[PDB]
C-alpha cells in the first residue's frame, strides 16, 4: 500500500527536574567508573 506514516506524523505533532535527576545519575555513573 501507499505508506502514510509521515503524513500521520505531521498531523500527530499538532530542562525538567526528572531530566536533571537522570543527568545526575549519568554523571555519577560515569564519574564512578572512569579513570
Amino acid at each position: 500500500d501507499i505508506n502514510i506514516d509521515d503524513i500521520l506524523a505531521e498531523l500527530d505533532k499538532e530542562v525538567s527536574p526528572q531530566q536533571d535527576f537522570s543527568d545526575l545519575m549519568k554523571s555519577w555513573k560515569n564519574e564512578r567508573c572512569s579513570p
Binding site: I2, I4, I7, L8, D12
Partner: protein, 424 residues
C-alpha cells in the same frame, strides 16, 4: 429442567473446597468459610484508604450478597433472612425476614444509598429504604440477577414463560425514573466438561458478572465470555447492546493461538475501557481464596477474522486493515459513550473532555489509515466515503495529502469540496 438459584455478582461455588466468594466488584470482595456448622464471613475492600476490612461469624449461612460504597447487604435464599451493614457503623445494622411461599427463594439482592432491593424466584420485587422501612412490593418476571451503582438499578429477569429480559432504573432521592422495563436481553445462555456443569449447577444463567462502567453504563458478561455494554441507554428508542470484548478471542490472541484452553476470564469491572478481571488457570472456571491481582484487558471490538490471522501467522501480528477497523470502531463507540456521559451527567474527574479529544484524534487516525488502503486499490468511491467520516478538518488535510500521493485527482477534487463545506 431449569432451576432457580441465588445469584450475586462474580460469586463462586464451593466446589470441592470449604470456602467461596459471595461477590466481588469494583469496591471489594466478600468470602465465606464453612466453619463446621456456621460460616465465617470476611468483607475485603480494594480501596483500603476509604474502607476497612471486617469479618463476622454467620449463624444463618448467607448465600446472597451485594457490596457497594455505603454498605454490605446479605441474604439467605431459602429462609428469607436479609441483613444490611453500613460501612461506617455510625448508622446501625438491621435485619429482616421477608416472606417466602413454599419453595420460593430470594434469587438476588441489591442496595442503593436510599434503598435496599430484594427479588425472588416467584417474581416478587420488594423495596425497603436504607433503614429497612418497607416501601413497595411489585411483581415482575423473576429477577435472576441484579445490581446497582449509586441510584441506577439494573436487573435481569427470566422464566420459562417470559424469556430472558432486563430492566434499567434510576431511583434517586427525587425524580424516580425508569428507562427500560423488561425488554428482551440479547445475552447467550449456556446449554440448559464436568467442572463447567458444576459451575452451571451453581449459576444456571451463566452470568459470570453484571455491573456498571465507571461512567455508569450497564454491562453484563455471559456464558459466551463476551462483554456486552448497553450503549445510549438514556434515550430508550436508540439504545443498543455493544459486544465490546470477546474475551475468548482476545485470550486466543494474546496467548499466540494454539487453541489455548484452561485459562478463563473472571470479570470485576469495566472502569472506562479496560476490564478488570482475574485470569483463572486450570480446570476450574472461578478464583481461589488468595484472590489474584485483577489483571486488565482493554476492550476489543470483535472484528478479528480468525482464519485471516491463522493464514498470516500460521506473538500474533495483526494486518493493518483489521487493526484500523477495530481502532476506528472502538474509538467511535467510546467517544459516543463519553459524549453521552458528559452531556447528561458531566465530568466527575477533571480530564474527560481531554480524553474525548485525544480519542477523536485516534478516530481520525484510524480513518486515515483505512483511507490509505482504499487509495492503494485506487477505489475513489470507498476512499471518498471514508473521507466523509473524519471529524477534524485539520485531519481532513491528510486525506488531501494521501490522495495527492496516491495520484487520485478525483479524490483531491471531491475532498476539497468537503474542505470548503466544512469551513462553511
Amino acid at each position: 429442567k431449569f432451576r432457580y438459584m441465588p445469584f450475586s455478582p462474580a460469586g463462586t461455588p464451593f466446589g470441592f473446597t470449604d470456602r467461596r466468594y459471595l461477590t466481588m466488584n469494583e469496591v471489594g470482595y466478600v468470602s465465606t468459610v464453612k466453619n463446621s456448622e456456621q460460616y465465617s464471613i470476611t468483607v475485603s475492600f480494594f480501596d483500603v484508604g476509604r474502607f476497612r476490612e471486617y469479618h463476622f461469624e454467620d449463624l444463618f449461612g448467607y448465600d446472597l450478597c451485594f457490596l457497594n460504597e455505603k454498605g454490605t447487604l446479605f441474604g439467605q435464599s431459602k429462609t428469607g433472612q436479609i441483613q444490611y451493614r453500613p460501612h461506617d457503623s455510625i448508622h446501625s445494622n438491621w435485619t429482616k425476614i421477608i416472606p417466602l411461599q413454599a419453595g420460593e427463594r430470594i434469587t438476588s439482592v441489591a442496595a442503593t444509598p436510599v434503598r435496599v432491593i430484594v427479588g425472588t424466584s416467584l417474581g416478587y420485587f420488594r423495596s425497603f429504604n436504607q433503614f429497612g422501612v418497607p416501601f413497595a412490593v411489585e411483581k415482575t418476571s423473576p429477577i435472576v440477577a441484579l445490581t446497582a451503582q449509586n441510584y441506577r438499578v439494573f436487573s435481569v429477569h427470566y422464566s420459562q414463560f417470559h424469556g430472558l429480559s432486563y430492566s434499567l432504573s434510576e431511583l434517586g432521592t427525587s425524580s424516580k425514573r425508569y428507562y427500560k422495563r423488561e425488554c428482551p436481553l440479547p445475552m447467550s445462555l449456556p446449554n440448559i466438561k464436568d467442572a463447567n456443569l458444576d459451575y452451571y449447577n451453581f449459576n444456571p444463567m451463566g452470568i459470570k458478572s453484571l455491573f456498571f462502567s465507571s461512567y455508569g453504563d450497564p454491562c453484563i458478561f455471559g456464558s459466551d465470555n463476551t462483554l456486552l455494554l448497553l450503549s445510549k441507554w438514556r434515550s430508550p428508542e436508540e439504545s443498543k447492546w455493544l459486544p465490546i470484548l470477546d474475551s475468548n478471542m482476545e485470550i486466543w490472541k494474546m496467548s499466540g493461538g494454539k487453541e489455548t484452553t484452561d485459562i478463563h476470564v473472571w470479570p470485576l469491572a469495566l472502569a472506562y475501557d479496560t476490564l478488570n478481571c482475574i485470569l483463572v488457570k486450570g480446570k476450574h472456571i472461578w478464583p481461589e481464596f488468595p484472590l489474584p491481582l485483577p489483571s486488565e484487558m482493554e476492550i476489543r471490538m470483535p472484528v478479528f477474522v480468525k482464519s485471516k490471522l491463522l493464514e498470516e501467522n500460521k506473538e500474533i501480528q495483526i494486518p493493518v486493515s483489521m487493526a484500523a477497523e477495530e481502532e476506528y470502531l472502538r474509538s467511535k463507540v467510546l467517544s459516543e459513550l463519553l459524549t453521552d456521559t458528559l452531556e447528561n451527567d458531566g465530568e466527575m474527574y477533571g480530564n474527560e473532555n481531554e480524553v474525548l479529544a485525544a480519542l477523536n484524534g485516534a478516530y481520525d487516525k484510524a480513518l486515515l489509515r483505512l483511507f490509505a488502503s482504499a487509495c492503494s486499490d485506487q477505489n475513489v468511491e470507498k476512499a471518498l466515503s471514508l473521507a466523509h467520516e473524519l471529524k477534524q478538518d485539520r485531519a481532513l488535510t491528510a486525506a488531501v495529502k494521501i490522495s495527492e500521493r496516491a495520484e487520485l485527482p478525483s479524490l483531491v477534487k471531491k475532498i476539497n469540496n468537503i474542505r470548503e463545506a466544512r469551513y462553511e
